[PDB]
Design a protein around this ligand. Structure first.
Ligand SMILES: [Mg+2]
Ligand SMILES: [Zn+2]
Ligand SMILES: [Zn+2]
Lengths: 50, 470, 1166
């Protein structure tokens, strides 16, 4: 909208076309990661980590 | 008794109707032929029904229409059409001038050549409608002239019909019957200005239509009769054949439409089947109607049985897709990969995912979730379209921040910046526009803006506006 | 002055039948299509169930086609597809419609139990439906021929009658027919005719029905509904956001079933239009009309026909009626519950360090709860540049903000609530004290009111946002402000267990210990003597103390003396403030006495001293209980040394009786009773052995050889003090435990001969099991029953609130001690306390006015009464109050958490119901069902009968199932003759006179009788005394007041006898009647005044009567209530509580009374 635009004009930001959906640890629970699994569709390219 | 459940109050109601005998079908069909042909002939005997067709063809070759919107073919192409119409016009231009005892034999043939034309149903409907409307027009003057005598001027209808029949146009009845010294005679003088002036349209009809008020009623009366006969017979046939409709509709049961919905759509199919049927081909009406009823059913289901309506070819595609898996289910002793059926099928092959997804039906928002408790699925659907109060506050604050800041600059810089953006004003302004309202116009404005922003860009100031970036 | 047009703040509400045109008023377009969305671009298909054109834009301030996207263009209807660009919220607002081809019955008015269309037309249901299905023809406006107007013919009959009668005879079939009937109907003509017909024939059969019908007709005229309206021409469509299609994860969709239903209705309707334009045979178009009727019926209320199932899913699709109804009730969503912001919950813990005005609140919880406050404060001082930055600060949990939270917490109370909220004390307000940890700390003294143990019970917190809520929380819901039970003036803040064991162990005396018989200057050096180990906590000692007495006029008198007491009592006295006598602490201080201490302290020194006193009592209780080193060992439970012997002798009895049975001397049954009796006696023997041994058997030496006093044994001190345990459970611990019963209830003749201290064996335990499970199941059930009872009760009362101040009547009930059969099962004092005297009472001598008419009798006045011998006090009751539509404070009583007289505007019906219902779990014909039966007014199973009139009676006729009793009064006519079944044994003397309300037989009596043949005061006394019997037998304290308000609601209705204004037998509000005859006795007719007769209606029945339909639709059957109200065009003015809660405006009780009253008077005024 308005002043938002104005603001982006002053600070020169490229505000993204991509929203952040990332999985983050639920609030208040604290622990150590003991394992990770990655399931992939049969036919989609596996990412680097996987 | 009646258990309600309208399937019953239907089944029992149709269950009375007797199955047609083989010959009876021909009886009914013949009745249909008689009935229709009556209205066709009554249309042929109408002069305006001829002249109209003439003017319409004159509109066709004048490029104000197309040959498909007038004729659905004759018995029998465009050149052939041109000459056929030439034939019709010819019989018209002879019959027209013969209206001096002998003409009748030619008028009958005019009817014949007119009968050679298969009109678009819409055109036919227009014709018949126009005729009956003309009869409404006649009824107008008839009831006006009747009521202006009997109800108003106090005259018996018994003696009113006497000088009526056979003329009802000229002044033989109006100006020669008032002097008869009847109790109702001298009374007719008070309305005389109203009757004779409305008589104009009445005699005008015999000019337009080219028929005396006598025949105008006769013709479309016969027409009405024929129409009645037709509808009567056809109805009879449909009511006779409902059992077939039900028997077919029992195949389509769980496709996502109600039983009675099925049988009703199928009933409409049967109606159409009766409408377009011809016994002269020797094709059994049973096996001919089966296709039509099945068509109404299948074509109806695909259309209306979904909360999300989908095109027909799509539905067909989906069905095929459901088959391939039947060949290959046990064949790939799991199920065929989501990408396999893709190569089976003719089309691009990533379309499987899309099509497969779109074809799914929505879930009842009342679908009970755990505990059997009143928590039901829809209760868990959050509003993602609402804006959080936590943000709304910050917006209302941004208004104050920017207002303060533009209150800090020079009023013309503040005006230029408030202008350059939609700030507390409608739309926002093209820099040219900004020039014109300023009268200082061009490259110029942008300079200020740049520096304006520049002033706001480093602090006292930016600190606040900067904190707003997350 | 123009009143106004656009939105003011409304009052009342109106419900009625809706016009085709009125239905069209709401409609912003006709939905012509079953289609919803396009299937790719998910945009709404115009025009259909989901449509942008008819309803609204899909996104805020944006056109559908996309041309006008700017917030500047608002009232513009886009040229392409007209959609005015406005917030998408309106898609949750705007209605629509569908124009039905054929007329259609509204199933709500067809299937409502007294079918509306049917009894309006005076036509049976089956006939109407029959016609609706095209299974028969029905006459309309038959004219004069052969035929009745409502008469129903058949095919052949219609054809025949038509061939005969041409015109001047009219018949139709289907919905169109019924609509023709309703439209042709002239109510006025019927009115005249019916009045005449009423007048002419004298038969009950005729005129009762006649009169009911005419009254119905005039009621329906007065309206504004007209008959055709029950038949639907136009069908409104529910706004689409209220039946949304919204997407899900996996690209999937989910939608309401209303779309399925509406779709069905639309498709069949359109198809009907088609079948009409195609000129289809009758058999077809009729089927389409039936199907459409079925579809519409399914849409409105599903289940009164075929119960249509939703797409692919067996479960029946929910309809609009079900949308209204909800379920698990009886629950309308203000009722069952509503989720609320600014709130939370967790497990609770102790926190004895707390003053009773506060509670430990976890840091994190208080952070998340006060979040907006924290933001606003943070940027108020300037620690945060802007609200955004303030979030980022608290999200960082920066070190500063805790200090700000300390600020926002200070004066700002929070509400604590537990799960089974019973009485009003189930919610209390405290002051938040920031605490490390995730658990809430709840003051011990309050643990009583909450019924909250520490075994993992969870409590919920709520923040009073608005200022009015803060002050309401502090001046009303505050912990310190309710120290007393609303059920009875007795303190609910009474110390519970550890504390009472503390004060008990402190103040008790042994025979001898260190410091025995010495003398000390005062409590100071007594404590000083104890702490240093020189003198025992408990030793007999004379000490100088200074007590005070305020017995001067509002002034404290000081006096000092040598008191013979113990070191413990002396130390404790330091806590007792001011005016209280030393006598109060000089006893042993059991849980009972420790309470009367607090109560006296309250009624003497006031609130504040009582509060701080209570706090101190708790603190010292815990501390000294900890010092005491109380414990429980295995040897602490002492089994009688004589137990085995008792068991042996009692065991010999059984074998005596057994030998007698073998010898036939005693029969089987009598034998069973004998053995059961001997064992039953044995149990009492062992119990009263172990109790003597356990209680006094400390035998200890002082100076001389021996002395014996009450034991210091731990478990004993526990059971005795009132800390915990009781002679029953102790009995089960040491002595043998009970006799059990099989599931049957046949009590086993071999009692458990072993207790818990000894081991039970396999049999004994297996047999104990049934008793255990029956216990758990029973209690768990009595929870539900109690709840149900409270519900019935608040439904019956509610809106009764203290309205006026003084109704000023001398009327009341005569208060005596209950004096039952022994001595004094309850005193006069408790019965008359806190109440207001109806009239000035005498000394035994007279023209001596001790208590002058209406004076709240407080404890002092009551004690003055007790000084003199006064045996009787007439007391104003809520049942007799002259004030209409409520109760005057002057007549209620003082009782509240505060000791002062009840305030104007407090809602007493609610707290009365709550007060009666809270103990309800504690109650074990008898029991809780007895209470329910009483409040329901239910006639017992085998009741007695009371003499209908005074005078000498005698027996006449014979043996026809009834042998008649013919009553003979002195002066009056004989004619009262009652028929009493002769196969019941009578009482009444054939040769003697009997007063009205005498015993003409025995057995319990129906309170209806007690009201009729005895009177109002008699019946209220009967109820109150019986329910009080039930409760008091269980040791439950409930003041008569609450039962008396309940009783007032019970007799609310009364049926007329005489005439001059209203109808003969109408059951009607006495408030209404009495107001109308008091108004009637003067003006009007000089006096036309009408007699009535009081009626007793049970609670569940009295609740049924309510003027407000919004209220009725809550707890009653909604489907019927809305119809039944809609026909009469009933206009709800709110007024009461339930409706105002539902509509979400201020309660017309409480703080709200000021508002509503102020408005209520502004209404119907200038
Ligand atoms: Mg518990
Ligand atoms: Zn548009
Ligand atoms: Zn009163």
């Amino acid at each position: 909208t308005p002043e938002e635009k104005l603001l982006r004009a002053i600070f020169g930001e490229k505000a993204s076309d991509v929203k952040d959906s990332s999985l983050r640890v639920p609030n208040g629970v604290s622990g150590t990661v003991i394992d990770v699994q990655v399931f992939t569709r049969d036919g989609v390219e596996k990412d680097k980590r996987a | 008794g009646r258990t309600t459940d309208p399937v019953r109050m239907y089944m029992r109601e149709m269950g009375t109707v007797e199955l047609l005998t083989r010959e009876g079908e021909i009886d009914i069909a013949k009745r249909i032929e008689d009935g229709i042909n009556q209205v066709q002939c009554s249309v042929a005997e109408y002069p305006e029904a001829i002249t109209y067709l003439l003017e319409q063809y004159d509109r066709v070759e004048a490029e104000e229409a197309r040959l498909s919107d007038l004729i659905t073919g004759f018995v029998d192409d465009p050149e052939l059409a041109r000459e056929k119409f030439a034939e019709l016009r010819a019989q018209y231009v002879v019959t027209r001038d013969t209206i001096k005892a002998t003409a009748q034999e030619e008028i009958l043939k005019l009817s014949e050549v007119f009968k050679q034309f298969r009109l678009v149903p819409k055109q036919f409907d227009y014709l018949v409608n126009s005729m009956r409307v003309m009869m409404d027009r006649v009824r107008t003057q008839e009831r006006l002239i009747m009521k202006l005598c009997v109800e108003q001027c106090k005259m018996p209808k018994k003696n009113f019909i006497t000088l009526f029949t056979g003329n009802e146009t000229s002044d033989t009845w109006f100006n020669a019957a008032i002097a008869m010294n009847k109790p109702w005679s001298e009374k007719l003088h008070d309305v005389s200005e109203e009757v004779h002036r409305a008589l104009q349209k009445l005699q005008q009809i015999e000019e337009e239509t080219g028929l005396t008020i006598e025949q105008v009623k006769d013709i479309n009366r016969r027409m009405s009769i024929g129409e009645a006969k037709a509808r009567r017979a056809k109805k009879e046939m449909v009511e006779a054949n409902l059992r077939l409709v039900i028997s077919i509709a029992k195949k389509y049961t769980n496709r996502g439409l109600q039983f009675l919905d099925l049988i009703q759509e199928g009933n409409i199919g049967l109606m159409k089947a009766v409408d377009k049927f011809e016994y002269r081909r020797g094709y059994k009406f049973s096996t001919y109607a089966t296709w039509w009823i099945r068509q109404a059913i299948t074509r109806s289901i695909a259309d209306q049985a979904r909360t999300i309506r989908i095109p027909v070819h799509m539905i067909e595609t989906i069905n095929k897709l459901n088959r391939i898996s039947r060949q290959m289910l046990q064949e790939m002793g799991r199920e065929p990969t989501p990408e396999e059926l893709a190569e089976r099928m003719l089309m691009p092959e990533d379309k499987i995912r899309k099509v497969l997804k779109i074809a799914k039906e929505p879930i009842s928002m009342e679908t009970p979730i755990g505990d059997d408790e009143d928590s039901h699925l829809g209760d868990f659907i959050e509003d993602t379209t609402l804006e959080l109060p936590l943000d709304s506050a910050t917006t209302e604050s941004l208004r104050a921040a920017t207002h303060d800041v533009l209150a800090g600059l020079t009023a013309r810089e503040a005006k230029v910046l408030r202008m350059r953006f939609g700030i507390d004003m409608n739309t926002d302004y093209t820099l040219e526009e900004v020039g014109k309202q300023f009268d200082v116009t061009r490259e110029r404005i942008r300079q200020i803006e740049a520096k304006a922003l520049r002033k706001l860009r480093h602090p006292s100031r930016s600190e606040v506006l900067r904190s707003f970036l997350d | 002055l123009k009143a106004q047009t656009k939105t003011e703040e409304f009052d009342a509400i109106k419900i009625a039948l809706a016009s085709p045109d009125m239905i069209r008023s709401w409609s912003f377009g006709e939905v012509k299509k079953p289609e919803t969305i396009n299937y790719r671009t998910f945009k709404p298909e115009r025009d259909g169930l989901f449509c942008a054109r008819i309803f609204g834009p899909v996104k805020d301030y944006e056109c559908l086609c996309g041309k006008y996207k700017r917030l500047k263009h608002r009232g513009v209807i886009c040229e392409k597809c007209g959609v005015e660009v406005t917030q998408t919220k309106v898609r949750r607002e705007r209605m629509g419609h569908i124009e039905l081809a054929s007329p259609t019955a509204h199933i709500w008015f067809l299937k409502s139990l007294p079918s509306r269309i049917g009894l309006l037309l005076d036509m049976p249901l089956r006939d109407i439906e029959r016609v609706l299905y095209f299974e028969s023809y029905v006459v309309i406006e038959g004219g004069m021929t052969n035929l009745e107007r409502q008469q129903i013919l058949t095919e052949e009959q219609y054809l025949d009658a038509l061939e005969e009668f041409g015109d001047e005879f009219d018949a139709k079939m289907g919905a169109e027919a019924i609509q023709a009937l309703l439209k042709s109907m002239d109510l006025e003509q019927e009115c005249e005719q019916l009045r005449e017909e009423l007048n002419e024939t004298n038969s009950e059969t005729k005129r009762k029905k006649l009169t009911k019908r005419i009254k119905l007709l005039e009621a329906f005229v007065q309206s504004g509904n007209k008959p055709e309206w029950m038949i639907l021409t136009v069908l409104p469509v529910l706004p689409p956001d209220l039946r949304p299609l919204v997407p899900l994860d996996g690209g999937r969709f989910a939608t309401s079933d209303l779309n399925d239903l509406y779709r069905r209705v639309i498709n069949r309707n359109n198809r009907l239009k088609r079948l009409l334009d195609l000129a289809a045979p009758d058999i077809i178009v009729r089927n389409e009309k039936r199907m459409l009727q079925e579809a519409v019926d399914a849409l409105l209320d599903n289940g009164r026909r075929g119960r249509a199932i939703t797409g692919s899913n067996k479960r029946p699709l929910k309809s609009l009626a079900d949308m209204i109804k909800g379920k698990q009730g009886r629950f309308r969503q203000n009722l069952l519950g509503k989720r609320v912001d600014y709130s939370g919950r967790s497990v609770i813990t102790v926190g004895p360090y707390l003053r009773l005005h506060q509670c430990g609140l976890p840091k994190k919880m208080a952070l998340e709860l006060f979040k907006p406050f924290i933001y606003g404060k943070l940027e108020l001082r300037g620690l945060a540049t802007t609200i955004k930055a303030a979030k980022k600060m608290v999200e960082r949990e920066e070190a500063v903000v805790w200090d700000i939270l300390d600020e926002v917490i200070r004066e700002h109370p929070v509400l604590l609530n537990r799960a089974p909220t019973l009485h009003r004390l189930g919610i209390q307000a405290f002051e938040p004290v920031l605490i490390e940890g995730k658990a809430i700390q709840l003051h011990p003294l309050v643990c009583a009111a909450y019924n909250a143990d520490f075994d993992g019970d969870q409590m919920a917190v709520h923040v009073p946002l608005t200022l009015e809520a803060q002050l309401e929380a502090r001046a009303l819901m505050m912990s310190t402000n309710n120290i007393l039970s609303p059920a009875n003036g007795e303190p609910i803040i009474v110390p519970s267990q550890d504390v009472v064991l503390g004060l008990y162990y402190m103040t008790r005396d042994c025979v001898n210990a260190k410091g025995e018989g010495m003398v000390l200057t005062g409590p100071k050096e007594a404590e000083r003597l104890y702490r240093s180990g020189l003198a025992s906590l408990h030793a007999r000692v004379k000490v100088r103390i200074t007590e005070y007495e305020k017995d001067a006029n509002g002034e404290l008198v000081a006096k000092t003396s040598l008191k013979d007491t113990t070191v413990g009592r002396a130390i404790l006295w330091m806590i007792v403030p001011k005016g209280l006598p030393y006598s109060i602490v000089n006893q042993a201080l059991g849980k009972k006495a420790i309470s009367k201490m607090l109560n006296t302290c309250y009624r003497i020194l006031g609130l504040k001293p009582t509060v701080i006193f209570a706090d101190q009592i708790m603190y010292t209780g815990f501390a000294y209980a900890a010092r005491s080193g109380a414990s429980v060992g295995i040897d602490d439970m002492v089994i009688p040394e004589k137990k085995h012997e008792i068991i042996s002798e009692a065991e010999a009895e059984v074998a005596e009786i057994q030998e007698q049975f073998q010898s036939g001397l005693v029969t089987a049954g009598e034998r069973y009773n004998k053995v059961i009796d001997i064992w039953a006696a044995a149990n009492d023997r062992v119990s009263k052995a172990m109790m003597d041994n356990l209680q006094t058997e400390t035998v200890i030496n002082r100076d001389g050889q021996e002395e014996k006093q009450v034991s210091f044994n731990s478990i004993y001190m526990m059971a005795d003090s009132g800390a915990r345990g009781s002679a029953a459970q102790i009995r089960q611990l040491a002595g043998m435990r009970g006799l059990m019963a099989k599931p049957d209830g046949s009590i086993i003749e071999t009692p458990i001969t072993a207790n818990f201290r000894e081991g039970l064996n396999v049999l004994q335990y297996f047999i104990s099991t049934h008793g255990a499970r029956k216990g758990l199941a029973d209690t768990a059930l009595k929870t539900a029953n109690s709840g149900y009872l409270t519900r019935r009760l608040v439904d019956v009362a509610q809106d009764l609130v203290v309205t006026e101040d003084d109704c000023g009547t001398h009327e009341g009930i005569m208060m005596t001690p209950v004096i039952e059969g022994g001595d004094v099962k309850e005193p006069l004092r408790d019965r008359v306390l806190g109440r207001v005297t109806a009239e000035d009472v005498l000394k035994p001598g007279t023209a001596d006015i001790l208590v002058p008419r209406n004076t709240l009798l407080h404890e002092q006045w009551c004690d003055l009464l007790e000084e003199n011998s006064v045996d009787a006090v007439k007391v104003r009751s809520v049942v007799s109050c002259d004030t209409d539509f409520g109760v005057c404070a002057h007549c209620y009583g003082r009782d509240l958490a505060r000791g002062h007289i009840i305030n104007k505007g407090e809602a007493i019906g609610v707290i009365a119901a709550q007060s009666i219902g809270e103990p309800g779990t504690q109650l074990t014909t008898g029991g809780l069902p007895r209470v329910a039966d009483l409040f329901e007014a239910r006639r017992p199973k085998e009741p007695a009968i009371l003499a209908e009139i005074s005078g000498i009676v005698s027996f006449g006729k014979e043996t026809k199932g009834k042998r008649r009793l013919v009553i003979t009064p002195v002066d009056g006519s004989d004619p009262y003759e009652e028929m009493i079944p002769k196969w019941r044994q009578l009482n009444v003397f054939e040769g003697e006179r009997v007063e009205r309300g005498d015993v003409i037989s025995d057995g319990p009596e129906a309170p209806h009788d007690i009201l009729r043949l005895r009177g109002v005061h008699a019946v209220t006394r009967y109820i109150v005394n019986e329910v009080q019997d039930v409760y008091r037998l269980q040791g439950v304290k409930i003041n008569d007041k609450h039962i008396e308000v309940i009783v007032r609601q019970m007799l609310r209705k009364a049926t007329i006898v005489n005439a001059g204004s209203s109808d003969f037998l109408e059951g009607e509000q006495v408030e209404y009647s009495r107001v109308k005859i008091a108004n009637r006795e003067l003006e009007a007719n000089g006096k036309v005044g009408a007699t009535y007769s009081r009626d007793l209606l049970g609670i569940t029945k009295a609740s049924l009567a309510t003027e407000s339909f919004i209220s009725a639709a809550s707890f009653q059957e909604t489907t019927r209530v809305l119809t039944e109200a809609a026909v009469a065009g009933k206009r709800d003015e709110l007024r009461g509580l339930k409706e105002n809660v539902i509509v979400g405006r201020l309660i017309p009780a409480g703080t709200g009374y000021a508002y509503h009253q102020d408005r209520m008077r502004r209404r119907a005024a200038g």
